[model samples]
Target chain A: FVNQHLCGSHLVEALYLVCXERXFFYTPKT
Target chain B: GIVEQCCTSICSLYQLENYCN
Candidate 1:
């Protein structure tokens, strides 16, 4: 469960960053 | 252990970006 959460956290961050990039940057493939 | 911690962190944000990217 511990490790799962860590990767989960990262993927979650990846998701968040991906979500915002398209809107914030509106430039390229973030 | 936090061994895999750094492993995944650097991987995701770089060469192994697919891990998170």
Candidate 2:
């Protein structure tokens, strides 16, 4: 179902955002 | 993160069905 598919995408998006933010915080100051 | 809930109010069956089926 689309809902299920969308749900998965939402999770990935959330995880991606979280990881992106985390990376941003941990990135070395170049 | 996603897949909030699929609840049947009467049944009160809350399922975090997860993403992809």
- The interface root-mean-square deviations, each candidate in sequence, come to 10.7, 14.7
Identify the CAPRI category of the predicted complex in candidate 2: incorrect
Query: Native contacts recovered by candidate 2, as a share?
Result: 0.02
In order of appearance, the predictions have TM-scores of 0.27, 0.28
DockQ of each model against the real complex?
0.09, 0.04
Off by over 4 Å in 2: A1-6, A21-30, B1-21
Which parts of model 1 are misplaced by more than 4 Å? A1-6, A21-30, B1-21
Q: Model 1, range B1-21, lDDT digits (tens) per residue?
A: 222432344323332233332
Q: RMSD to the native, candidate 1?
A: 10.2
Q: All models: lDDT? A: 0.34, 0.30
Residue B7 CA error for candidate 1 (Å)? 14
Return the lDDT, model 1, position A11: 45
